[PDB]
């Protein structure tokens, strides 16, 4: 006999979203991973991506 | 200094009612912890850990 406390009210979620930029073009991976050419690595390449 | 001497004594003529307060503390808060709400919240891994 008595009262007992027991979990906080829980709420469970319904359903699942995502929110991602509006980005359609594709990363270039065709002129970093087969470029022609690579740098020294004294003087390496840095590209912005 | 109170002037002692052999066969002196001091007996008081009149009074004084005075009122003092006093303030004692009795309770404090009662309070209750959730482990699984303020460790890990809503994740279900964490939960499961
Ligand atoms: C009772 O007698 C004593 C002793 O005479 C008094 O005490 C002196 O009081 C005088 C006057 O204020 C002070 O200058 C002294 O420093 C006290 N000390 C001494 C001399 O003992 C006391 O005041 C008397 N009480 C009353 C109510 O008359």
């Known amino acids: ?49 | 200094s109170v002037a002692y001497s052999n066969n002196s004594i001091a007996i008081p003529t009149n009074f004084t009612i005075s009122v003092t307060t006093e303030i004692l503390p009795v309770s404090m808060t009662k309070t209750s912890v959730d482990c699984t709400m303020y460790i890990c919240g809503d994740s279900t891994e964490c939960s499961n850990l």
């Open chain 1, 1 to 49: 006999k008595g009262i007992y406390q027991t979990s906080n009210f829980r709420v469970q979620p319904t359903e699942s979203i995502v929110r991602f930029p509006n980005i359609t073009n594709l990363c270039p991976f065709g002129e970093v991973f087969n470029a022609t050419r690579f740098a020294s690595v004294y003087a390496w390449n840095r590209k912005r991506i």
